[PDB]
C-alpha cells in the first residue's frame, strides 16, 4: 500500500467522505463517498481492498447504528456492499487475521456489546466467535503474531484500563496486563513487537499520553505524548511509523495528523485533514488506478 485512506467520521453530523493521503508527497485526494454517512466505524484492508465496518449515521433526520460492511476497490473507485454483521456496532474496533476481519464490541442503542464476529471475504459471510470477557465500546483493537487484542473502551458504566487477548485456535479470550491509563476511544495499533494505545477519553479528559504493551514482557510502558490531546482518533501504520488522524480534544474536532517515529521517540505534525472530524475509519492500501 502507498496511501492512508480515511473514511467517514463526524463533524456536526456523520460524514460520507473518503479521502487518501500520500505521505510521499503531502497530497490529499477526495475519492468516492460512502453510500451511507457514518461515524464511529473502523477501516481495515484485506487483499488490497478497503473495508468500512460498523459505525452510526448521526444525522438530523435520525440516528441509525450500522451493521454494514462495505468494500472500496481502489482499482475502480467504487464502493460495494458486503454481507452485514449480526448486529449494529457503533464505536467498533476491528482486526484482521489471516485474511479474516474480526469485528469487536461497539454499541447498538444502549446495548454495549461483548460479542465478536468474523468475516470471511471468500464466502462473504459473518460468523460469531467467543465473546470478550468485557463489554467494550470505543474499543481499541490490534493484531500481533496472529493474536487479536481488545484494549480499553467503555462498558456502559466505566471507562476501562483493561485489555484482553483472543487465541483463535482455542476460540477463547483471556485478560492481559491492564494499561497504566483508563482509555476509551483511543487509537490502538501494532508496531514491531508492541501494541500501542494513543490518547482516548477517561470520562473526564481527552488524553495525549501514549503507552505500549510488549507481548514478551507483558508490561506497558509510556512513550512520548502526542502534541494534541485527542479521543475518537483514527490510527494506522504506514512505512513503520504510526499516524494518528483527527479526533476530539474537548474543544475542537481536530484536523491534526501526527506521526510517531519509534527510533527518535518523537511525534511530529505531518499534514492536516481537509476538515476537522472525529470517529473516522482509517487503513492503508494502494493508490487508486
Ligand X SMILES: Cn1nnc2cc([C@H](CC(=O)O)c3ccc(Cl)cc3)ccc21
Residues forming contacts to ligand X in the complex (CB under 6 A) are: 12, 40, 91, 138, 154, 159, 184-185, 201, 206, 231-232, 248, 278-279
- Please give the span between the terminal C-alpha atoms of the chain, in angstroms, as a whole number: 12
Complex with ligand X: residue 18 or 74, whichever CB lies closer: 18
Least distance in Å: CB of 89 to ligand X? 12
Maximum C-alpha span of the chain: 50
Complex with ligand X: residue 81 or 156, whichever CB lies closer: 156
Least distance in Å: CB of 21 to ligand X? 19
Q: Between β-strands 210-214 and 194-198, what pairing exists: parallel, antiparallel or unpaired?
A: antiparallel
Complex with ligand X: residue 91 or 113, whichever CB lies closer: 91
Least distance in Å: CB of 143 to ligand X? 19
Length of the chain, please? Answer: 289
Least distance in Å: CB of 249 to ligand X? 8
Complex with ligand X: residue 43 or 185, whichever CB lies closer: 185
Least distance in Å: CB of 95 to ligand X? 16
Handedness of CA 117, 121, 122, 123 (dihedral sign): positive
Least distance in Å: CB of 284 to ligand X? 19
The Cα–Cα gap between 59 and 205 comes to 26
Which residues contact residue 54 at a Cβ distance below 8 angstroms, ignoring those fewer than 6 apart? Answer: 38, 40, 41, 42, 66, 67, 68, 85, 88, 89, 90, 92, 94, 103, 106
Complex with ligand X: residue 63 or 77, whichever CB lies closer: 63
The Cα–Cα gap between 59 and 73 comes to 27
CA distances from 251 to 109, 185, 248, 254 (A): 25, 16, 7, 9
Complex with ligand X: residue 248 or 267, whichever CB lies closer: 248
Closest CA to 81 of 38, 110, 117: 38
The Cα–Cα gap between 180 and 57 comes to 33
Complex with ligand X: residue 14 or 184, whichever CB lies closer: 184
User: Do residues 99 and 47 lie in contact, with contact meaning Cβ atoms separated by under 8 Å?
Assistant: yes
Least distance in Å: CB of 154 to ligand X? 4
Closest CA to 51 of 284, 288, 231, 237: 284
User: Do residues 90 and 78 lie in contact, with contact meaning Cβ atoms separated by under 8 Å?
Assistant: no
The Cα–Cα gap between 116 and 92 comes to 10
Least distance in Å: CB of 226 to ligand X? 15
Complex with ligand X: residue 23 or 281, whichever CB lies closer: 281
Amino acid at each position: 500500500g502507498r496511501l492512508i485512506y480515511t473514511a467517514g467520521g463526524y463533524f456536526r453530523q456523520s460524514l460520507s467522505y473518503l479521502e487518501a493521503y500520500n505521505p510521499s508527497n503531502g497530497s490529499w485526494l477526495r475519492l468516492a463517498d460512502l453510500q451511507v454517512p457514518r461515524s464511529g466505524l473502523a477501516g481495515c484492508v484485506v487483499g488490497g481492498l478497503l473495508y468500512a465496518v460498523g459505525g452510526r449515521n448521526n444525522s438530523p433526520d435520525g440516528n441509525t447504528d450500522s451493521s454494514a460492511l462495505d468494500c472500496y476497490n481502489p482499482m475502480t473507485n467504487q464502493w460495494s456492499p458486503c454481507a452485514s454483521m449480526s448486529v449494529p456496532r457503533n464505536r467498533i474496533g476491528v482486526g484482521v487475521i489471516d485474511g479474516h476481519i474480526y469485528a469487536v464490541g461497539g454499541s447498538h442503542g444502549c446495548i454495549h456489546h461483548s460479542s465478536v464476529e468474523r468475516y470471511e471475504p471468500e464466502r462473504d459471510e459473518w460468523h460469531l466467535v467467543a465473546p470478550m470477557l468485557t463489554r467494550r465500546i470505543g474499543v481499541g483493537v490490534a493484531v500481533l503474531n496472529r493474536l487479536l487484542y481488545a484494549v480499553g473502551g467503555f462498558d456502559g458504566t466505566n471507562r476501562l484500563n483493561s485489555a484482553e487477548c483472543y487465541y483463535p485456535e482455542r476460540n477463547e479470550w483471556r485478560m492481559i496486563t491492564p494499561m497504566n491509563t483508563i482509555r476509551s476511544g483511543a487509537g490502538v495499533c501494532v508496531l514491531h513487537n508492541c501494541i500501542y494505545a494513543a490518547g482516548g477519553y477517561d470520562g473526564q479528559d481527552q488524553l495525549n499520553s501514549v503507552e505500549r504493551y510488549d507481548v514478551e514482557t507483558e508490561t506497558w510502558t509510556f512513550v512520548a505524548p502526542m502534541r494534541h490531546h485527542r479521543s475518537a482518533l483514527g490510527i494506522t501504520v504506514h512505512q513503520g511509523k504510526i499516524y494518528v488522524l483527527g479526533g476530539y480534544d474537548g474543544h475542537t474536532f481536530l484536523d491534526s495528523v501526527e506521526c510517531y517515529d519509534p527510533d527518535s521517540d518523537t511525534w511530529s505534525e505531518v499534514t492536516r485533514m481537509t476538515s476537522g472530524r472525529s470517529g473516522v475509519g482509517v487503513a492503508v492500501t494502494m493508490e487508486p488506478c
